[PDB]
Design an enzyme around this catalytic site. Structure first.
Site, mmCIF file in Angstrom:
data_model
loop_
_atom_site.group_PDB
_atom_site.id
_atom_site.type_symbol
_atom_site.label_atom_id
_atom_site.label_comp_id
_atom_site.label_asym_id
_atom_site.label_seq_id
_atom_site.Cartn_x
_atom_site.Cartn_y
_atom_site.Cartn_z
ATOM 1 N N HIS A 14 12.937 0.004 -1.205
ATOM 2 C CA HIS A 14 12.753 -0.560 0.069
ATOM 3 C C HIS A 14 13.833 -0.038 0.987
ATOM 4 O O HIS A 14 13.707 -0.394 2.206
ATOM 5 C CB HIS A 14 12.414 -1.907 0.310
ATOM 6 C CG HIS A 14 11.272 -2.373 -0.784
ATOM 7 N ND1 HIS A 14 11.416 -2.801 -1.947
ATOM 8 C CD2 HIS A 14 10.071 -2.545 -0.282
ATOM 9 C CE1 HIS A 14 10.304 -3.112 -2.454
ATOM 10 N NE2 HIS A 14 9.397 -3.009 -1.419
ATOM 11 N N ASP B 43 16.835 -3.850 -6.121
ATOM 12 C CA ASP B 43 15.704 -3.501 -5.314
ATOM 13 C C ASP B 43 15.197 -2.212 -6.318
ATOM 14 O O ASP B 43 14.629 -1.072 -5.833
ATOM 15 C CB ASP B 43 15.675 -3.261 -4.134
ATOM 16 C CG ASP B 43 14.488 -2.790 -3.086
ATOM 17 O OD1 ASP B 43 13.378 -3.260 -3.598
ATOM 18 O OD2 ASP B 43 14.717 -2.102 -2.424
ATOM 19 N N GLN C 76 -20.098 -18.126 8.847
ATOM 20 C CA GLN C 76 -18.929 -18.465 9.963
ATOM 21 C C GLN C 76 -17.626 -18.626 9.532
ATOM 22 O O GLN C 76 -17.456 -19.834 8.564
ATOM 23 C CB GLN C 76 -19.325 -19.195 11.120
ATOM 24 C CG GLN C 76 -20.794 -19.254 11.454
ATOM 25 C CD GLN C 76 -21.233 -20.005 12.848
ATOM 26 O OE1 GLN C 76 -22.585 -20.248 12.716
ATOM 27 N NE2 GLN C 76 -20.422 -20.600 13.526
ATOM 28 N N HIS D 129 -0.508 2.104 -2.122
ATOM 29 C CA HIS D 129 0.077 1.905 -3.573
ATOM 30 C C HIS D 129 -1.025 2.502 -4.530
ATOM 31 O O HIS D 129 -0.706 2.891 -5.878
ATOM 32 C CB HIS D 129 0.854 0.755 -3.992
ATOM 33 C CG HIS D 129 1.978 0.529 -3.193
ATOM 34 N ND1 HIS D 129 3.105 1.714 -3.788
ATOM 35 C CD2 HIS D 129 2.653 -0.501 -2.684
ATOM 36 C CE1 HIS D 129 4.090 0.931 -2.947
ATOM 37 N NE2 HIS D 129 3.788 -0.017 -2.146
ATOM 38 N N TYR E 140 5.385 -10.792 10.794
ATOM 39 C CA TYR E 140 6.672 -11.175 10.614
ATOM 40 C C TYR E 140 7.201 -11.998 11.773
ATOM 41 O O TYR E 140 6.945 -11.767 13.083
ATOM 42 C CB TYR E 140 7.529 -9.678 10.636
ATOM 43 C CG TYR E 140 8.928 -9.833 10.208
ATOM 44 C CD1 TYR E 140 9.099 -10.339 8.900
ATOM 45 C CD2 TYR E 140 10.005 -9.724 11.065
ATOM 46 C CE1 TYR E 140 10.536 -10.454 8.319
ATOM 47 C CE2 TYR E 140 11.265 -9.648 10.729
ATOM 48 C CZ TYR E 140 11.511 -10.215 9.355
ATOM 49 O OH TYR E 140 12.806 -10.175 8.882
ATOM 50 N N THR E 141 7.946 -13.178 11.579
ATOM 51 C CA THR E 141 8.717 -13.978 12.387
ATOM 52 C C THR E 141 8.097 -14.453 13.565
ATOM 53 O O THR E 141 8.280 -13.783 14.775
ATOM 54 C CB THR E 141 10.107 -13.428 12.839
ATOM 55 O OG1 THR E 141 9.847 -12.206 13.236
ATOM 56 C CG2 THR E 141 10.918 -13.404 11.425
ATOM 57 N N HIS F 193 -0.647 -0.531 3.547
ATOM 58 C CA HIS F 193 0.581 -0.305 2.670
ATOM 59 C C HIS F 193 0.348 -0.435 1.182
ATOM 60 O O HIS F 193 0.428 0.423 0.210
ATOM 61 C CB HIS F 193 2.092 -1.020 3.134
ATOM 62 C CG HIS F 193 3.069 -0.981 2.224
ATOM 63 N ND1 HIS F 193 4.276 -0.323 2.722
ATOM 64 C CD2 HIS F 193 3.389 -1.388 1.049
ATOM 65 C CE1 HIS F 193 5.096 -0.453 1.834
ATOM 66 N NE2 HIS F 193 4.597 -1.136 0.691
ATOM 67 N N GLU F 194 -0.016 -1.671 1.004
ATOM 68 C CA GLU F 194 -0.354 -2.061 -0.471
ATOM 69 C C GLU F 194 -1.459 -1.241 -1.167
ATOM 70 O O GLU F 194 -1.540 -0.993 -2.288
ATOM 71 C CB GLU F 194 -0.304 -3.492 -0.586
ATOM 72 C CG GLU F 194 0.776 -4.049 -0.098
ATOM 73 C CD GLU F 194 2.010 -3.532 -1.146
ATOM 74 O OE1 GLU F 194 1.792 -3.440 -2.167
ATOM 75 O OE2 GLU F 194 3.250 -4.048 -0.675
ATOM 76 N N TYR G 280 8.077 3.429 -10.127
ATOM 77 C CA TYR G 280 8.749 2.545 -9.196
ATOM 78 C C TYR G 280 10.189 2.416 -9.423
ATOM 79 O O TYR G 280 10.557 1.002 -9.428
ATOM 80 C CB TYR G 280 7.727 1.267 -8.925
ATOM 81 C CG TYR G 280 7.763 0.597 -7.680
ATOM 82 C CD1 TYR G 280 7.156 1.154 -6.542
ATOM 83 C CD2 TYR G 280 8.528 -0.598 -7.615
ATOM 84 C CE1 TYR G 280 7.250 0.503 -5.353
ATOM 85 C CE2 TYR G 280 8.635 -1.320 -6.144
ATOM 86 C CZ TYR G 280 7.971 -0.719 -5.194
ATOM 87 O OH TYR G 280 8.051 -1.334 -4.113
ATOM 88 N N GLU H 96 7.133 4.086 -1.843
ATOM 89 C CA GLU H 96 7.406 3.066 -0.842
ATOM 90 C C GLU H 96 7.107 3.772 0.369
ATOM 91 O O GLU H 96 6.255 3.231 1.380
ATOM 92 C CB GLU H 96 8.694 2.328 -0.934
ATOM 93 C CG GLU H 96 8.780 0.958 -1.683
ATOM 94 C CD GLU H 96 7.609 0.014 -1.132
ATOM 95 O OE1 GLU H 96 7.787 -0.030 0.020
ATOM 96 O OE2 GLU H 96 6.916 -0.271 -1.731
HETATM 97 C C1 0A9 Z 1 9.061 -5.980 0.336
HETATM 98 O O1 0A9 Z 1 7.887 -6.180 0.477
HETATM 99 C C2 0A9 Z 1 7.078 -5.106 0.615
HETATM 100 O O2 0A9 Z 1 7.536 -4.283 1.832
HETATM 101 C C3 0A9 Z 1 5.524 -5.406 0.567
HETATM 102 N N1 0A9 Z 1 5.276 -5.958 -0.864
HETATM 103 C C4 0A9 Z 1 4.766 -6.220 1.755
HETATM 104 C C5 0A9 Z 1 4.849 -5.631 2.977
HETATM 105 C C6 0A9 Z 1 4.402 -4.225 3.489
HETATM 106 C C7 0A9 Z 1 4.389 -3.978 4.656
HETATM 107 C C8 0A9 Z 1 4.856 -4.501 5.809
HETATM 108 C C9 0A9 Z 1 5.408 -6.037 5.403
HETATM 109 C C10 0A9 Z 1 5.551 -6.389 3.959
HETATM 110 CA CA CA Z 2 8.386 -11.594 15.008
HETATM 111 CA CA CA Z 3 -18.216 -21.361 7.264
HETATM 112 ZN ZN ZN Z 4 5.208 -1.024 -1.160
#
Ligand code: 0A9
Ligand code: CA
Ligand code: CA
Ligand code: ZN
Ligand code: 0A9
Ligand code: 0A9
Ligand code: CA
Ligand code: CA
Length: 316
Positions: free
Chosen positions: A231, A226, A61, A146, A193-194, A142-143, A157, A166
């Site tokens: 990004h 960057d 659990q 990659h 986020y936020t 997203h990751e 990259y 990206e």
């Molecule tokens: C800048 O960081 C990048 O965008 C990703 N490393 C993390 C991410 C992916 C998708 C959404 C939010 C965050």
């Molecule tokens: Ca938010």
């Molecule tokens: Ca547990």
């Molecule tokens: Zn990425």
């Protein structure tokens, strides 16, 4: 580890209850044997040493606050695996059922997540910019995308190839979000986020300019920050992908949308057959056009829409 497959229950970062595939041998481990060579989730224990310890739980659990990021990393890796297998006939990120490894509780206050060439890594956020980042299916997908890119096109990259890398991750992160069908959108990172602000996100595919990112090649960033804007300039490609799927008129150029599933087919084929480590935006256009031609024919609506979408964002 060697043991028997079991089914645990827990709560994710957003407080939702879900079942997770575990393995029992004295402890219950976050090890899902039901997908390829396994999905394995690790505790980094607020450090930066990786992977950390395979996640062990006494009772199967996973309702503790400490558990929540692990539940989601583990579960959303499974959803992502299922998307690639069921939608694209791709077995894990390498096409040969590679084990998917993730570590949570990376560092302290870490406002990011990443693929490191070998595994997924998730910060907990600082509680104000981000909550633990595995709570976002688009982030997880997203990751992991990659990893797919690394094994396929191999897009370097930096500069335009990096921005394509990206954008591919934002595109498939979104398509996985739609596949799972919980509050899907064309925004990136909104779920984690936020927590103090409703309706925002880190990036937008529908309107990249919302967050300052370019939506036309004439607005591309040409400096060195960057990794040459990977990004930032991703917004130009993200907008083209959004237009291919959804349609619209952008800077006076009208695009007939063909929907998400065809977007995915075209871009998956482009990624896996036609992109190379050094592909630029013009070469991506060509790859997408050829992919759409392979699938639908040169005179198809699909090819016409791919061309209009790249025209609309200024990529020839
Ligand atoms: C800048 O960081 C990048 O965008 C990703 N490393 C993390 C991410 C992916 C998708 C959404 C939010 C965050
Ligand atoms: Ca938010
Ligand atoms: Ca547990
Ligand atoms: Zn990425
Ligand atoms: C200078 O960068 C900005 O202040 C960032 N917040 C990106 C942005 C630019 C413009 C409008 C909205 C967002
Ligand atoms: C802080 O990162 C940003 O808000 C990203 N949208 C990148 C960016 C920075 C500044 C201006 C334009 C775009
Ligand atoms: Ca969403
Ligand atoms: Ca989203």
């Amino acid at each position: 580890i060697t043991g028997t497959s079991t089914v645990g229950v827990g709560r994710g970062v957003l407080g939702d209850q879900k079942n997770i595939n575990t393995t029992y041998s004295t402890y219950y481990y976050l090890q899902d044997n039901t997908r390829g060579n396994g999905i394995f989730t690790y505790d980094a224990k607020y450090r930066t040493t990786l992977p950390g310890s395979l996640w062990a739980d006494a009772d199967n659990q996973f309702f503790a606050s400490y558990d929540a990021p692990a539940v989601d990393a583990h579960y959303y890796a499974g959803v992502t695996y299922d998307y690639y297998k069921n939608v694209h006939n791709r077995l894990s990120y390498d096409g040969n059922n590679a084990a998917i490894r993730s570590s949570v509780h990376y560092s302290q206050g870490y406002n990011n997540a990443f693929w490191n060439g070998s595994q997924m890594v998730y910060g907990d956020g600082d509680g104000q910019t981000f909550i633990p980042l595995s709570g976002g299916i688009d982030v997880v997908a997203h990751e992991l995308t990659h990893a797919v890119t690394d094994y396929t096109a191999g897009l370097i990259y930096q500069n335009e190839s990096g921005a394509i890398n990206e954008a591919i991750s934002d595109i498939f992160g979104t398509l996985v979000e739609f596949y799972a069908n919980k509050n899907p959108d064309w925004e990136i990172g909104e779920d984690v986020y936020t927590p103090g602000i409703s309706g925002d996100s880190l990036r937008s595919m529908s309107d990249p300019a919302k967050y300052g990112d370019p939506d036309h090649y004439s607005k591309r960033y040409t400096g060195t920050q960057d990794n040459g804007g990977v990004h930032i300039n991703s917004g130009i490609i993200n907008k083209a992908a959004y237009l291919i799927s959804q349609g619209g008129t952008h800077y006076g150029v009208s695009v007939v949308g063909i929907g998400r599933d065809k977007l995915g087919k075209i871009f998956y084929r482009a990624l896996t057959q036609y992109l190379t480590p050094t592909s630029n935006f013009s070469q991506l256009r060509a790859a997408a056009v050829q992919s759409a031609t392979d699938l639908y024919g040169s005179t198809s609506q699909e090819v016409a829409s791919v061309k209009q979408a790249f025209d609309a964002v200024g990529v020839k």
